[PDB]
Amino acid sequence: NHNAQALNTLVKQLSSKFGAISSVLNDILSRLDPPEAEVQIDRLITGRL
């Protein structure tokens, strides 16, 4: 039970935005430009770490 709960929580944490426009990198890459995507990417990186 503990192992399954931990893995499920870790997987579910991937859908949080942490203060960005979206929680998916693929759309941000194909919707914005390079000089402004890093600001959104940094928050996701910090949260997932």
Partner 1 sequence: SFTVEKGIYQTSNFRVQPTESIVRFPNITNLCPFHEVFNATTFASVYAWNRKRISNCVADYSVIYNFAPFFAFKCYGVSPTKLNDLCFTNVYADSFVIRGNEVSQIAPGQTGNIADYNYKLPDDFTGCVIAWNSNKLDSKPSGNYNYLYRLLRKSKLKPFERDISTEIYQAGNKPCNGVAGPNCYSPLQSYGFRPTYGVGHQPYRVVVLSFELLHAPATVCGPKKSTNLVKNKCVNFNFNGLTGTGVLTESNKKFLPFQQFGRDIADTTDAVRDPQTLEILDITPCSFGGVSVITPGTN
Interface residues with partner 1 (CB under 8 A) are: 8, 11-12, 15, 21-22, 26-27, 30-33, 36
Q: Which of 2/36 has CB closer to partner 1? A: 36
- For the bound state, the minimum distance from the C-beta of residue 33 to partner 1, rounded and expressed in Å, comes to 4
Sign of the four-CA dihedral 7, 47, 21, 28: negative
* Residue corresponding to tokens 């919707």: 31
- For the bound state, the minimum distance from the C-beta of residue 26 to partner 1, rounded and expressed in Å, comes to 6
Sign of the four-CA dihedral 8, 14, 17, 19: positive
- For the bound state, the minimum distance from the C-beta of residue 31 to partner 1, rounded and expressed in Å, comes to 6
* Residue corresponding to tokens 């430009």: 33
